[PDB]
Design a protein around this ligand. Structure first.
Ligand code: 017
Lengths: 99, 99
């Protein structure tokens, strides 16, 4: 599909058996998902943005379906205000920026 | 161009006569540029991102060239980690996400 940018580019995702809305985010290196009590091994990470850093849990090889497109990779879980699909999974679903 | 997302979507911008590097950021509502001298009046605003809120100077109707494409609109100037071109200007240069 083609997504214009008049509004936030939000899509439905499925992760850890849950449906969520998430932002397709070309400005995020990594994918960050709002706090959820998920299983699996993880490593502590800190990620920085506008305002400073938040502490997150890094899970590897997490399967996510993004707008019907399957992806598998690193998902960071923590107190983000919005669910963010970053470049690590955008590349896997064939997403480009065009102008 | 069509821009794939294996690398950060960094482009050269010209703002207030100065060349800068900026990130094309579909997850940003607003364009936020690092502290710099900008001519004219501005108003104090705050904006929030992943780590909390910062104070910025809002400059309106700023002419900015983005990867060779002209925009004129709002630029927030403040202590952002990265120069970000947000949707308020991505829409002006005809940028869409595609997959
Ligand atoms: C600042 C960017 C270089 C990086 N970020 C992605 C960015 O797209 C966030 C994504 C975002 C969006 C909303 C809330 C938090 C983070 N947007 C953002 O800070 O935009 C601000 C400027 O315009 C406003 O519109 C939305 C918030 C404001 S980030 O959220 O901090 C970020 C940093 C690291 C990773 N792995 C993932 C995301």
């Amino acid at each position: 599909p083609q997504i214009t940018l008049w509004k936030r580019p939000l899509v439905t995702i499925r992760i850890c058996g849950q449906l969520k809305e998430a932002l397709l985010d070309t400005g995020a290196d990594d994918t960050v998902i709002e706090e959820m009590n998920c299983p699996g091994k993880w490593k502590p990470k800190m990620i920085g943005g506008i305002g400073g850093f938040i502490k997150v849990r890094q899970y590897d090889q997490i399967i996510i379906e993004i707008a019907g497109h399957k992806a598998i990779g690193t998902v960071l879980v923590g107190p983000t205000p919005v669910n963010i699909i970053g470049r690590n999974l955008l590349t896997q679903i064939g997403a480009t920026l065009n102008f």
